[PDB]
Amino acid sequence: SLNWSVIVPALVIVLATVVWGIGFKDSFTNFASSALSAVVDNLGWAFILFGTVFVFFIVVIAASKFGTIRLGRIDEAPEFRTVSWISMMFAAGMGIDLMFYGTTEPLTFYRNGVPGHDEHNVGVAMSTTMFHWTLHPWAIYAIVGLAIAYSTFRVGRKQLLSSAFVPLIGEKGAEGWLGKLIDILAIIATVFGTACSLGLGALQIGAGLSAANIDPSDWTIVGIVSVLTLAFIFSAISKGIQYLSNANMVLAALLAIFVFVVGPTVSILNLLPGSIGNYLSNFFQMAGRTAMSADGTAGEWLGSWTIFYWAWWISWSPFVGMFLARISRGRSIREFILGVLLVPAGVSTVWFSIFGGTAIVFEQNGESIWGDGAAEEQLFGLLHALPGGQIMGIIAMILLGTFFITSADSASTVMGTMSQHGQLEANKWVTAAWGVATAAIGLTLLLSGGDNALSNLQNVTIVAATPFLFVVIGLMFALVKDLSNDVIYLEYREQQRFNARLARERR
Amino acid sequence: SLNWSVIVPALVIVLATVVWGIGFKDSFTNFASSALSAVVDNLGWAFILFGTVFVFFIVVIAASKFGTIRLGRIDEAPEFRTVSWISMMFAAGMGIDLMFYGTTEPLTFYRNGVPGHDEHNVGVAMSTTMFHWTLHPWAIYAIVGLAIAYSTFRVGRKQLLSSAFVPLIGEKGAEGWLGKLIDILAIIATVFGTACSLGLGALQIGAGLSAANIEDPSDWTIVGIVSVLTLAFIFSAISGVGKGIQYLSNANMVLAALLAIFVFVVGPTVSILNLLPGSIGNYLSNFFQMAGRTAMSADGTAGEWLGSWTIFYWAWWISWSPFVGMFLARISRGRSIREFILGVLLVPAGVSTVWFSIFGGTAIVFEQNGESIWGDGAAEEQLFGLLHALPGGQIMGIIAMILLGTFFITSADSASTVMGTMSQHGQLEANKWVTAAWGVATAAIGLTLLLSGGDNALSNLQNVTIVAATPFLFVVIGLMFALVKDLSNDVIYLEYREQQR
Amino acid sequence: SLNWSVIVPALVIVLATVVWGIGFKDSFTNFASSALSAVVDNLGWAFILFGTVFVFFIVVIAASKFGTIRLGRIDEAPEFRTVSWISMMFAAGMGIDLMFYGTTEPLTFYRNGVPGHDEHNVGVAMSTTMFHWTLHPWAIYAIVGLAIAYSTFRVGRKQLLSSAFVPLIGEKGAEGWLGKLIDILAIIATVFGTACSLGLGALQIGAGLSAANIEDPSDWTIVGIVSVLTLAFIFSAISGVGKGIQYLSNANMVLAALLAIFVFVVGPTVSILNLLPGSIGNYLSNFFQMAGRTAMSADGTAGEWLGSWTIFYWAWWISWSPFVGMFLARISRGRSIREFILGVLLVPAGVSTVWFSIFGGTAIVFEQNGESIWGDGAAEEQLFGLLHALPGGQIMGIIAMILLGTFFITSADSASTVMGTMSQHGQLEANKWVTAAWGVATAAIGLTLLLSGGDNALSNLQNVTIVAATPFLFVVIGLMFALVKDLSNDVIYLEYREQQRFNARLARERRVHNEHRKRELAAKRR
Ligand SMILES: CCCCCCCCCCCCCCCCCC(=O)O[C@@H](COC(=O)CCCCCCCCCCCCCCC)COP(=O)(O)OC[C@H](O)CO
Ligand SMILES: C[N+](C)(C)CCO
Ligand SMILES: [Cl-]
Ligand SMILES: [Cl-]
């Protein structure tokens, strides 16, 4: 029983873009990309504040008595071992994203420096990438994850973001004016979310083909996408996602290990203890970077970096949020939070220490893989400066390929599950539908922009993300009232008032 | 009822100082002002060390078991609602200058920069201000407000600073040396406290009239206002069925809210709005450095800046601890210390942060855009400069002027109320005569400090505020132990104490 | 009994480096000094990363329920009690070091400036010195301290160090590949660690007596230093016997606390008392920015600084942790895990600071004027240089050397107590025989390190030490697990977690029923 009151209203906006953005006008879509600067200008501070708010909030609810509450029936045990549960979070913290921004990210920060420091600054440069990729985003993923994993397993509700707002909203048939709306926002956000990954993931393949066959064609993008958006429909008949799920991790294993030993090992090893310290050291300092610091200048830097990421992450929380939820059944609220923060974070700490960590060492010996200044080639260029690095580049391409599909599967499945009343049992057909409709806008962005295709990709996803921002914000409140009414916290507060009164009349 | 064993030493010393500052004695009270440097130099270490400890202390106390413990007969019906604090918290604690400082400070620290940094640093300029007006000034209040409220609304003892030292001194044996000296210094500091509040309100008016009517305060101004506000306060204190403290404060929040909301919308809204995360994050970051900004840093330079700022800021604060602290109790009963510690922390922080961010932040926004409002550089002229720079300036200016008048009568009467309550053997309710009488006891000096001829006198008291409570610093430190080695003699700890151990 | 299986492979290489340094290829030992530039740069990261983790590690253990477990057969009324602790913390652990680096480190930093900062930074000058002599170092101790203390006094087994590794290598069956090898690497690390401190006395005295007499070189003149101070040392020797030590604990106080309260009241009392919160503050504000200092920061240019300071320290501390944990363990019986961790960290770290605040402070304040104490760049000269600049500079200068004479025996005595204890199957009783034995451990290298044609047998001192116990790092690493995977099996904690379960499920039975009675009842209103 598909939810059409939610499916089509979403497809109305997904098409609006592909139609009005490539077919007709085209130059007009770049008008809404001025509504970008509109949103960062005045809704900008929100992302910054509630950003760091999401990181405290979650730690404190995990630190609280809530943490003990078992996600599922009372004293329910997890379904997999700690090791297997963690062995699944690793696959959650890897994909196109890190492929793209792995090397270029910390390099840019070394190259140009971060608003508030000089250029050529390892400590800062590094601790900024962390800022983006460790605690902060995963704090979000936890908010949405816990909210879903709680309402479904504990309270006993449908697997829908709206079913997490029940404590605040009607109710009496949750999905009146809101609900449908809240879900319609989830859907849209997830599309543009994955869109970026597919998007910047695509043209990182095209730029990568300039390692085998030789330059930056245009019909090539449509090729790389369509070639893989077909393989996605192909491998949309089994799951599937689990086969390649490791096929990805092994390739990602090669790339890393390889560059660990061939590259400046001891440097890369120095970056671990080093880029965990500057992270902590600078955390608050970068927590407060807005468009006032540094002397009303960092406004631009935020738009291109810190505020992009924040939007992106949010527009992905509906996807990642279900994943971690679905997996974590059984875990305690705390075990699930501390788990969700530190686990993926370790990998995002090593990964940037390896790839973009050599890019810094290189730029210190003159080597410089800057390659004309485009990140989309930065990666391969990095490898080409290492022995047998040309085969590695080939691997990387086939890797971003396997990523394109697996990343699209999980996305479409989630977007499917919530496009039809939270049915865990995903309809094989509606899944592929959300993939093509997604890959679609993942292409509609890449094409409409030209030389700065990357730009519009990040501006729209920021736009469609902003609405949800508020959703997730509110998902705190629904999550606190949901917890304060939970048996185990209610029953405990009854035991200390009793463990107080029992000694109030014996004296 | 009127305790005349402490009224005397105070009424005489307070009269001794005013004389040694008037009648051609105006110069020898200035040389005595530079004797302040003595304390800032040798007790510098003292303030900047413990000022930060208190902040950790209440936290470490709210954190532990002592937190759950209400203050009273347990589950004792609270009383005053949420609006009780926010009002008096900023009505008695501050309000007067925190309108001049709401702009001149964040605007100064930007322009000239604080030690160990470079100028035009928005972050620092906000973190330093914030530092001077949050966790710190409210812990050296919480300590007091928590101690007293416990040694009365729990134990039952009488509301008087020495009574809270019972745990350290002895059962009633606090009558000797340590105990009488307390009440004197607590009265001196509260008499000067009001005196300084009356003085600031007067220097403000000068610039207020400059906004409305100017004219380089040609006499009449100090009297025709300080008296107007004294005679306006002496009326809102007499009428029993009036309670100006519970009203004017509420009105005060409404005026300040109005004013704030004005600039916040007409002015650089987003800037203010970007300054919220900007302020907090920065504050958290620059906390442990500016917490340890000793006069040894940097390279020995910050000596002056500290004394003129942070230090003076502390020595000044420590003074208003009796009054403000007592008030954090005279209007609270039944709500656990924990729901109180953060009550006077998380909450005052919020308002101050926001206030500065709005004003101070806007000032920086102006400073950057080239349309400054620093002009000539008088702290007392800047608030209005920023104001008149906005549509409906002169208008909002009038109410801004009124604001300085509001809370004033309260900050003075409520400052005198606590006096009347600490003068009559620590009685919650005090005679309507002793309270208002002390609220004007400073007026008798204010009119003599100007009869010297022309103008050049008040400057004394400004610096005398520091040393006016210099010793009262330690009165806090000990009060910190008298609150730890006292709660461990409470019901829950004494039962496990007198058990197997 | 004696372990002629761990001590045999012991002195065989203890001297295979001693006679190797003084004899054989004299300048071949200067190839190992360029061989640490293989660990310091290749393991420097691993020395930092885990060094910091060490400070979080215990701190949580301290706050953990583990922090209630008492150390030894439940009750065990506190053995020594207090004071003797903080006195034997340093006397044993630090002691002499607090001087031959404690009044010059805040000074060298105020001068040259640490990497990532300009010179003349009172702040970093204080912050970077503490990073080395406070929270970080002691935390390496409290681990081995607990691991060892809990291993012996609680469980009730041997005082041999490798014992604490039975929860990981199996109990009673961890003697072979791993086990004896640990004890071997243990005794060595304690010999060198001690030999270094003993040789320092001669070096600091030879170049320290300059404030009195002996302007000659520094070779045969020192024969009356090493050979005499050790001669007067063993006494001791004639009698022990079982405990103190001690006669040095209250000594160090009266003595140090004297010269300290001396400079604190004579010198710039305020400039010191000011730098009091300034020390702590800046320390906290820079803690994470210091633990992030690597040979990749700043801009891959601080390696030769770190290698001279930070890593230098960390490496050494692990190579000195055996003794200082073996000794820290005693006098701690009947003291809880918590009060032990908050004992080794808070107070020792809380005094080192006020030490650098008085000595490092005035030493700095003297430079802010022009009366520099810097004596041609020599650690010994600076110490006396700043006290002879105060009324009675030769009256306290006396104690500057004569007191350091006590620290000589404090280390040796206490240290020997440990190395002796670990070669006797791990018993506690005072073994006079082995005590004085290892007491030698320097007569073949210490006094010979100088007879090498006059002097210059450096740095064959610091070189051999930090490389000796380079695997020790990975030992104090896996010591965290053997500490926690052991603490957790303790009856008191084993019972704490079981009770949780009970309450847990019982509380479910109470609930699952109501929702089945307020349900049948709810279906009764129909
Ligand atoms: C600026 C730098 C200066 C120096 C910094 C020093 C170091 C920082 C100090 C950090 C303090 C952390 C304190 C940790 C205490 C542990 C909690 C505890 O003792 O719980 C007891 C028992 O309590 C309970 O079991 C129930 C309630 C536990 C409450 C835990 C709260 C969560 C803490 C998370 C906060 C931070 C998370 C990381 C992100 C910042 C003990 O049992 P256990 O430790 O054996 O339990 C182990 C646990 O189950 C793991 O398997
Ligand atoms: C879960 N994904 C890997 C798809 C996104 C996080 O990088
Ligand atoms: Cl549960
Ligand atoms: Cl400094």
CSV table of N, CA, C and O in Angstrom, one decimal, chain B residues 5-7 9-11 13-14 144 148 159-165 177-195 316-327 414-424 426 438 442 465 467-476 479:
chain,number,residue,atom,x,y,z
B,5,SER,N,25.1,47.6,67.3
B,5,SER,CA,26.5,47.2,67.6
B,5,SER,C,27.3,47.1,66.3
B,5,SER,O,28.6,47.0,66.3
B,6,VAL,N,26.6,47.2,65.1
B,6,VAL,CA,27.3,47.1,63.8
B,6,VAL,C,26.9,48.4,63.0
B,6,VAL,O,27.6,48.8,62.1
B,7,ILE,N,25.7,49.0,63.4
B,7,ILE,CA,25.3,50.2,62.7
B,7,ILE,C,26.3,51.3,63.0
B,7,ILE,O,26.5,52.2,62.2
B,9,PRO,N,29.8,51.3,63.9
B,9,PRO,CA,31.1,51.2,63.2
B,9,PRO,C,30.9,51.6,61.7
B,9,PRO,O,31.8,52.2,61.2
B,10,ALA,N,29.8,51.2,61.2
B,10,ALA,CA,29.5,51.4,59.8
B,10,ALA,C,29.1,52.9,59.6
B,10,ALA,O,29.7,53.6,58.8
B,11,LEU,N,28.1,53.3,60.3
B,11,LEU,CA,27.6,54.7,60.2
B,11,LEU,C,28.7,55.7,60.4
B,11,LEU,O,28.7,56.9,60.0
B,13,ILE,N,32.4,55.0,60.1
B,13,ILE,CA,33.4,54.8,59.0
B,13,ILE,C,32.9,55.4,57.7
B,13,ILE,O,33.6,56.0,57.0
B,14,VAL,N,31.6,55.1,57.4
B,14,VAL,CA,31.0,55.6,56.1
B,14,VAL,C,30.9,57.1,56.2
B,14,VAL,O,31.0,57.8,55.1
B,144,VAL,N,27.4,32.9,47.7
B,144,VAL,CA,26.7,33.7,48.7
B,144,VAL,C,25.3,33.3,48.8
B,144,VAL,O,24.8,32.7,49.8
B,148,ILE,N,23.9,31.6,52.4
B,148,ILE,CA,22.9,32.2,53.2
B,148,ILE,C,21.5,31.5,53.2
B,148,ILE,O,21.0,31.1,54.2
B,159,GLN,N,19.4,35.4,58.9
B,159,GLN,CA,20.0,35.9,57.6
B,159,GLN,C,21.0,37.0,57.8
B,159,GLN,O,20.7,38.1,57.7
B,160,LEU,N,22.3,36.5,58.0
B,160,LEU,CA,23.4,37.4,58.2
B,160,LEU,C,24.7,36.7,57.8
B,160,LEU,O,24.9,35.6,58.3
B,161,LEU,N,25.5,37.3,57.0
B,161,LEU,CA,26.7,36.7,56.4
B,161,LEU,C,27.5,35.8,57.4
B,161,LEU,O,28.1,34.8,57.0
B,162,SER,N,27.6,36.3,58.6
B,162,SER,CA,28.4,35.6,59.6
B,162,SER,C,27.8,34.3,60.0
B,162,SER,O,28.5,33.3,60.3
B,163,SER,N,26.5,34.3,60.0
B,163,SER,CA,25.7,33.1,60.4
B,163,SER,C,26.0,31.9,59.5
B,163,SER,O,25.9,30.8,60.0
B,164,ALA,N,26.4,32.2,58.3
B,164,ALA,CA,26.7,31.1,57.3
B,164,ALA,C,28.1,30.6,57.6
B,164,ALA,O,28.5,29.5,57.1
B,165,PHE,N,28.9,31.3,58.4
B,165,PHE,CA,30.2,30.9,58.8
B,165,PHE,C,30.2,30.0,60.1
B,165,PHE,O,31.2,29.6,60.6
B,177,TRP,N,35.8,38.4,67.4
B,177,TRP,CA,36.5,39.0,66.3
B,177,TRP,C,35.8,38.7,65.0
B,177,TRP,O,35.0,39.5,64.5
B,178,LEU,N,36.1,37.5,64.4
B,178,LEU,CA,35.5,37.1,63.1
B,178,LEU,C,34.0,36.9,63.3
B,178,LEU,O,33.5,36.0,63.9
B,179,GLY,N,33.2,37.8,62.7
B,179,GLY,CA,31.7,37.8,62.8
B,179,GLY,C,31.1,39.2,62.9
B,179,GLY,O,30.1,39.5,62.3
B,180,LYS,N,31.7,40.0,63.8
B,180,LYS,CA,31.4,41.4,63.9
B,180,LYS,C,32.0,42.2,62.7
B,180,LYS,O,31.3,43.0,62.1
B,181,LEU,N,33.2,41.9,62.4
B,181,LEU,CA,34.0,42.5,61.4
B,181,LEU,C,33.3,42.3,60.0
B,181,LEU,O,33.2,43.1,59.2
B,182,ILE,N,32.7,41.1,59.9
B,182,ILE,CA,32.0,40.7,58.7
B,182,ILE,C,30.8,41.7,58.4
B,182,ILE,O,30.8,42.3,57.4
B,183,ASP,N,29.9,41.8,59.4
B,183,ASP,CA,28.7,42.7,59.2
B,183,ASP,C,29.1,44.1,58.8
B,183,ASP,O,28.4,44.7,58.1
B,184,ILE,N,30.2,44.6,59.4
B,184,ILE,CA,30.7,45.9,59.1
B,184,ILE,C,31.1,46.0,57.6
B,184,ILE,O,30.7,46.9,56.9
B,185,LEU,N,31.9,45.1,57.2
B,185,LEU,CA,32.4,45.1,55.8
B,185,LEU,C,31.3,44.9,54.8
B,185,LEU,O,31.3,45.3,53.7
B,186,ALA,N,30.3,44.1,55.2
B,186,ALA,CA,29.2,43.8,54.4
B,186,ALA,C,28.2,45.0,54.3
B,186,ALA,O,27.5,45.1,53.3
B,187,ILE,N,28.2,45.8,55.3
B,187,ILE,CA,27.4,47.0,55.3
B,187,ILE,C,28.1,48.1,54.5
B,187,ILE,O,27.5,48.8,53.7
B,188,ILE,N,29.4,48.3,54.8
B,188,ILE,CA,30.2,49.2,54.1
B,188,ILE,C,30.1,49.0,52.6
B,188,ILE,O,29.9,50.0,51.8
B,189,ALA,N,30.3,47.8,52.1
B,189,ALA,CA,30.2,47.4,50.7
B,189,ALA,C,28.9,47.6,50.1
B,189,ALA,O,28.7,47.9,48.9
B,190,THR,N,27.8,47.5,50.9
B,190,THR,CA,26.4,47.7,50.4
B,190,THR,C,26.1,49.2,50.4
B,190,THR,O,25.3,49.6,49.5
B,191,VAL,N,26.6,50.0,51.3
B,191,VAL,CA,26.4,51.4,51.3
B,191,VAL,C,27.1,52.0,50.1
B,191,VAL,O,26.6,52.9,49.4
B,192,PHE,N,28.4,51.6,49.9
B,192,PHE,CA,29.1,52.0,48.7
B,192,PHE,C,28.5,51.5,47.4
B,192,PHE,O,28.5,52.2,46.4
B,193,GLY,N,28.0,50.3,47.5
B,193,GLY,CA,27.4,49.6,46.4
B,193,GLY,C,26.3,50.5,45.8
B,193,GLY,O,26.2,50.8,44.6
B,194,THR,N,25.4,51.0,46.7
B,194,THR,CA,24.3,51.9,46.3
B,194,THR,C,24.9,53.2,45.9
B,194,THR,O,24.4,53.8,44.9
B,195,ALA,N,25.9,53.7,46.6
B,195,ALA,CA,26.5,55.0,46.3
B,195,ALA,C,27.1,55.0,44.9
B,195,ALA,O,27.0,56.0,44.2
B,316,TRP,N,35.4,44.6,42.1
B,316,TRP,CA,34.1,45.3,42.1
B,316,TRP,C,33.0,44.3,42.4
B,316,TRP,O,32.1,44.5,43.2
B,317,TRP,N,32.9,43.2,41.6
B,317,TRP,CA,31.9,42.2,41.8
B,317,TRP,C,31.9,41.7,43.3
B,317,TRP,O,30.8,41.8,43.9
B,318,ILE,N,33.0,41.3,43.8
B,318,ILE,CA,33.1,40.7,45.1
B,318,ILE,C,32.3,41.6,46.1
B,318,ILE,O,31.8,41.1,47.1
B,319,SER,N,32.3,42.9,45.8
B,319,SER,CA,31.6,43.9,46.6
B,319,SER,C,30.1,43.6,46.7
B,319,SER,O,29.5,43.5,47.8
B,320,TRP,N,29.5,43.5,45.5
B,320,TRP,CA,28.0,43.3,45.4
B,320,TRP,C,27.5,41.9,45.7
B,320,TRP,O,26.4,41.6,45.5
B,321,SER,N,28.4,41.1,46.2
B,321,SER,CA,28.1,39.7,46.6
B,321,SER,C,27.0,39.6,47.8
B,321,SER,O,26.1,38.8,47.7
B,322,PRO,N,27.2,40.4,48.8
B,322,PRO,CA,26.2,40.4,49.9
B,322,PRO,C,24.8,40.7,49.4
B,322,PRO,O,24.0,39.9,49.4
B,323,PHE,N,24.7,41.9,48.9
B,323,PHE,CA,23.4,42.4,48.4
B,323,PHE,C,22.8,41.4,47.3
B,323,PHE,O,21.7,40.9,47.6
B,324,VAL,N,23.5,41.2,46.2
B,324,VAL,CA,23.0,40.4,45.2
B,324,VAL,C,22.8,38.9,45.6
B,324,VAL,O,21.8,38.3,45.2
B,325,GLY,N,23.7,38.4,46.4
B,325,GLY,CA,23.6,37.1,47.0
B,325,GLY,C,22.4,36.9,47.9
B,325,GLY,O,21.6,36.0,47.7
B,326,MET,N,22.3,37.8,48.8
B,326,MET,CA,21.1,37.8,49.7
B,326,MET,C,19.8,37.8,49.0
B,326,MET,O,18.9,37.1,49.3
B,327,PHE,N,19.8,38.6,47.9
B,327,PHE,CA,18.5,38.8,47.1
B,327,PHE,C,18.2,37.5,46.4
B,327,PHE,O,17.0,37.2,46.1
B,414,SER,N,16.1,47.9,46.7
B,414,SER,CA,16.3,46.5,47.0
B,414,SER,C,17.7,46.3,47.6
B,414,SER,O,18.0,45.3,48.2
B,415,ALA,N,18.6,47.3,47.3
B,415,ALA,CA,19.9,47.3,47.9
B,415,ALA,C,19.8,47.7,49.3
B,415,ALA,O,20.6,47.3,50.2
B,416,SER,N,18.8,48.6,49.6
B,416,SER,CA,18.6,49.1,51.0
B,416,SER,C,17.8,48.1,51.8
B,416,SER,O,18.0,47.9,53.0
B,417,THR,N,16.9,47.4,51.1
B,417,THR,CA,16.1,46.4,51.8
B,417,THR,C,17.0,45.3,52.5
B,417,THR,O,16.9,45.1,53.7
B,418,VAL,N,17.9,44.7,51.7
B,418,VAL,CA,18.8,43.8,52.2
B,418,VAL,C,19.6,44.3,53.3
B,418,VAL,O,20.1,43.6,54.3
B,419,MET,N,19.8,45.7,53.3
B,419,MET,CA,20.6,46.4,54.4
B,419,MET,C,19.7,46.3,55.6
B,419,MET,O,20.2,46.0,56.7
B,420,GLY,N,18.5,46.8,55.5
B,420,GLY,CA,17.6,46.8,56.7
B,420,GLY,C,17.4,45.4,57.3
B,420,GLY,O,17.1,45.2,58.5
B,421,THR,N,17.6,44.4,56.4
B,421,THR,CA,17.4,43.0,56.9
B,421,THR,C,18.7,42.4,57.5
B,421,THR,O,18.6,41.5,58.3
B,422,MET,N,19.8,43.0,57.1
B,422,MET,CA,21.1,42.6,57.7
B,422,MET,C,21.5,43.5,58.8
B,422,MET,O,22.6,43.3,59.4
B,423,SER,N,20.7,44.5,59.2
B,423,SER,CA,21.0,45.4,60.3
B,423,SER,C,20.1,45.0,61.5
B,423,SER,O,20.5,45.4,62.6
B,424,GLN,N,19.0,44.4,61.3
B,424,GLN,CA,18.1,44.0,62.4
B,424,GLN,C,18.3,42.5,62.7
B,424,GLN,O,17.3,41.7,62.4
B,426,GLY,N,19.5,40.1,61.2
B,426,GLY,CA,19.1,39.2,60.1
B,426,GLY,C,17.6,38.8,60.0
B,426,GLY,O,17.3,37.6,59.9
B,438,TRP,N,19.0,54.4,54.8
B,438,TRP,CA,20.3,54.1,54.3
B,438,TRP,C,20.4,54.3,52.8
B,438,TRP,O,21.5,54.4,52.2
B,442,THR,N,23.8,58.0,51.5
B,442,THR,CA,24.9,58.3,50.5
B,442,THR,C,24.6,59.7,49.9
B,442,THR,O,25.5,60.4,49.5
B,465,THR,N,35.6,51.6,45.5
B,465,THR,CA,34.8,50.4,45.4
B,465,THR,C,35.6,49.2,45.4
B,465,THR,O,35.3,48.2,46.1
B,467,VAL,N,38.8,48.6,46.8
B,467,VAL,CA,39.3,48.3,48.2
B,467,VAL,C,38.2,48.3,49.2
B,467,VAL,O,38.4,47.8,50.3
B,468,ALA,N,37.0,48.7,48.8
B,468,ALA,CA,35.8,48.8,49.7
B,468,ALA,C,35.4,47.4,50.1
B,468,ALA,O,34.7,47.2,51.1
B,469,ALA,N,35.9,46.4,49.4
B,469,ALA,CA,35.5,45.0,49.6
B,469,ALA,C,36.7,44.1,49.3
B,469,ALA,O,36.6,42.9,49.2
B,470,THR,N,37.9,44.7,49.3
B,470,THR,CA,39.1,43.9,49.1
B,470,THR,C,39.2,42.7,50.0
B,470,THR,O,39.4,41.6,49.6
B,471,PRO,N,39.1,42.9,51.3
B,471,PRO,CA,39.1,41.8,52.3
B,471,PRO,C,37.9,40.9,52.0
B,471,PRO,O,38.1,39.7,52.2
B,472,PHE,N,36.8,41.4,51.6
B,472,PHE,CA,35.6,40.6,51.4
B,472,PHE,C,35.8,39.5,50.4
B,472,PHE,O,34.9,38.6,50.2
B,473,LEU,N,36.9,39.5,49.7
B,473,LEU,CA,37.3,38.4,48.8
B,473,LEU,C,37.4,37.1,49.6
B,473,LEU,O,36.7,36.1,49.3
B,474,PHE,N,38.2,37.1,50.6
B,474,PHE,CA,38.4,36.0,51.5
B,474,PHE,C,37.1,35.6,52.2
B,474,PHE,O,36.9,34.4,52.5
B,475,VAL,N,36.3,36.5,52.5
B,475,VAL,CA,34.9,36.3,53.0
B,475,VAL,C,34.2,35.3,52.2
B,475,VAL,O,33.3,34.6,52.6
B,476,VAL,N,34.6,35.2,50.9
B,476,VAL,CA,34.0,34.3,50.0
B,476,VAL,C,34.7,32.9,50.1
B,476,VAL,O,34.0,31.9,50.2
B,479,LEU,N,33.7,31.2,52.9
B,479,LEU,CA,32.2,30.9,52.8
B,479,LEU,C,32.1,29.7,51.8
B,479,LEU,O,31.1,29.0,51.9
